[PDB]
Amino acid sequence: ETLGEKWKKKLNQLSRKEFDLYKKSGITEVDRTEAKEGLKRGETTHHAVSRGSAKLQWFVERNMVIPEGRVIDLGCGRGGWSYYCAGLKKVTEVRGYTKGGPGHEEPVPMSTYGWNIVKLMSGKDVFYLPPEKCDTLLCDIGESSPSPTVEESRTIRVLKMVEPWLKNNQFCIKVLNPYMPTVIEHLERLQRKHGGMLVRNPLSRNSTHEMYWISNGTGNIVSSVNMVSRLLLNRFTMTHRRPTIEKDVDLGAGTR
Numbered sequence: 255e256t257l258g259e260k261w262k263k264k265l266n267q268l269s270r271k272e273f274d275l276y277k278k279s280g281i282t283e284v285d286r287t288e289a290k291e292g293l294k295r296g297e298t299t300h301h302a303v304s305r306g307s308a309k310l311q312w313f314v315e316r317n318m319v320i321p322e323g324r325v326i327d328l329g330c331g332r333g334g335w336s337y338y339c340a341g342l343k344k345v346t347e348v349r350g351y352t353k354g355g356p357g358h359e360e361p362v363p364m365s366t367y368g369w370n371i372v373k374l375m376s377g378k379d380v381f382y383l384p385p386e387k388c389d390t391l392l393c394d395i396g397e398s399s400p401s402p403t404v405e406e407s408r409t410i411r412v413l414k415m416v417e418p419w420l421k422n423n424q425f426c427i428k429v430l431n432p433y434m435p436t437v438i439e440h441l442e443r444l445q446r447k448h449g450g451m452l453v454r455n456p457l458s459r460n461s462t463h464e465m466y467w468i469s470n471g472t473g474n475i476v477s478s479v480n481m482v483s484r485l486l487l488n489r490f491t492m493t494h495r496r497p498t499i500e501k502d503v504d505l506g507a508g509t510r
């Protein structure tokens with residue numbers, strides 16, 4: 255039994271009150287007040303459509319993934335990653351695909367900086383899509399489940415799906431459940447072939463063990479995974495720590 259599975263058993267035993275006080279204990283988060291207010295009024299400039307823009311921003315500002323040329327965004331949802339990449343000088347095109355329909359977010363049309371190079375397509379299940387030529391591959395897919403064996407199936411399927419889209423290019427791929435032993439085996443094989451490293455984003459809630467496989471970095475995957483399991487287990491041991499609250503991202507306005 256991995257440390258991650260122990261964390262999961264404990265997470266599953268929490269009452270709703272304890273879960274709500276655990277999920278943001280000691281994390282970092284952006285203040286969405288202004289953007290939620292503006293988005294409700296129908297404003298299409300400056301605002302990120304979701305928390306996702308700031309989440310990808312954290313990786314890019316640390317050079318973990320460096321978007322360039324044709325950017326593919328798998329599971330773009332509302333489009334937070336796509337609108338963030340559209341404003342980057344090395345980016346020439348952004349194509350986002352997302353499922354849509356019941357239970358799934360729809361792309362939000364915006365006019366933030368670089369909107370003219372973005373095309374978000376809904377009604378697109380990525381597990382039925384042929385790979386496309388691209389220079390940057392982004393994937394934020396992985397639905398949480400109380401069952402780590404369900405999450406393990408979901409993680410492996412994403413990892414197997416993205417591989418054909420990785421053609422010596424930049425990448426940032428969400429790994430829903432990186433602690434399950436068969437997931438570790440797949441990641442290690444993928445790291446040998448494609449390089450990169452698994453990283454824990456500070457903006458991720460304690461209610462998920464998600465890590466991101468990024469193209470620019472190196473390291474021991476098992477060791478970084480167990481470090482997160484230990485951190486997440488330690489956050490059950492003390493009274494809620496209020497999160498670090500940061501300014502949300504300003505994505506500007508206008509064409510590129």
Ligand SMILES: Nc1cc(Cl)ccc1NC(=O)Nc1cccc(S(=O)(=O)Oc2ccc(C(=O)O)cc2)c1
Pocket residue numbers: 354355356357358359360
């Ligand atoms: N596209 C669409 C087309 C049609 Cl015909 C009908 C509905 C939609 N739209 C969605 O079903 N949106 C949607 C987007 C994200 C999640 C979910 S959800 O998981 O189903 O339900 C939640 C989850 C959490 C919360 C909350 O407040 O925390 C609220 C609702 C739905």
Ligand SMILES: C[S@@+](CC[C@H](N)C(=O)[O-])C[C@H]1O[C@@H](n2cnc3c(N)ncnc32)[C@H](O)[C@@H]1O
Pocket residue numbers: 303304305306307328329330331332333334335336351352353354357358359378379380381394395396
């Ligand atoms: C975490 S959200 C993406 C958040 C986004 N990166 C942002 O910044 O706004 C993951 C998205 O993947 C979508 N998704 C899940 N399964 C999918 C599939 N099979 N094909 C395409 N999109 C899928 C979900 O509907 C959801 O919107």
